[PDB]
Design an enzyme around this catalytic site. Structure first.
Site, PDB file in Angstrom:
ATOM      1  N   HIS A   1      -3.440  -1.928   7.958  1.00  0.00           N
ATOM      2  CA  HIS A   1      -4.543  -2.243   7.060  1.00  0.00           C
ATOM      3  C   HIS A   1      -4.987  -0.989   6.311  1.00  0.00           C
ATOM      4  CE1 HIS A   1      -8.439  -3.795   5.723  1.00  0.00           C
ATOM      5  NE2 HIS A   1      -9.009  -2.740   6.283  1.00  0.00           N
TER       6      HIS A   1
ATOM      7  N   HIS B   1       0.762  -1.257   0.000  1.00  0.00           N
ATOM      8  CA  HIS B   1       0.000   0.000   0.000  1.00  0.00           C
ATOM      9  C   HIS B   1       0.786   1.297   0.000  1.00  0.00           C
ATOM     10  CE1 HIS B   1      -3.627  -2.322   0.109  1.00  0.00           C
ATOM     11  NE2 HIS B   1      -3.346  -2.848   1.290  1.00  0.00           N
TER      12      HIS B   1
ATOM     13  N   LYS C   1      -4.506  -9.743  -7.377  1.00  0.00           N
ATOM     14  CA  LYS C   1      -5.364  -9.036  -6.463  1.00  0.00           C
ATOM     15  C   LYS C   1      -6.313  -8.168  -7.291  1.00  0.00           C
ATOM     16  CE  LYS C   1      -5.389  -6.535  -2.137  1.00  0.00           C
ATOM     17  NZ  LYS C   1      -4.513  -5.738  -1.237  1.00  0.00           N
TER      18      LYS C   1
END
Length: 121
Positions: A114, A13, A40
């Site tokens: 996350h 990320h 993904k």
């Protein structure tokens, strides 16, 4: 001590300075960051420095959000890579969407672990 989840977060990320954030950017980085077996379906990268992103975990650049998440005060340069072709397997073709907006994360011990992908769908 170390946080393997913060480490995974960075891998999946974070991209400090991407340059051109087109389709081929996505195709290269998705492969590079190990996200292509299987492909993904949607993955978003945050750009700029890491201390802004960490600061989402504190009052500095974040507010509590929903069930156990955090939402940033500042906007970030982002690039969303979205899979097309209906096949889950390589070669993985991606459409890039550059964005500039606030991000939602979950934190542990002051570290992002996350990224909420749903806000980019």
């Amino acid at each position: 001590q170390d946080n393997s989840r913060y480490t995974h977060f960075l891998t999946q990320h974070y991209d400090a300075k991407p340059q051109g954030r087109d389709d081929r950017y996505c195709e290269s980085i998705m492969r590079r960051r190990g996200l292509t077996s299987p492909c993904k379906d949607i993955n978003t990268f945050i750009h700029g420095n890491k201390r802004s992103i960490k600061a989402i975990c504190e009052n500095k650049n974040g507010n509590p959000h929903r069930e156990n998440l955090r939402i940033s005060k500042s906007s970030f340069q982002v690039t969303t890579c979205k899979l097309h072709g209906g096949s889950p397997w390589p070669p993985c073709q991606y459409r890039a969407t550059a964005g500039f907006r606030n991000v939602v994360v979950a934190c542990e011990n002051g570290l992002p672990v996350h990224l909420d992908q749903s806000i980019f769908r």
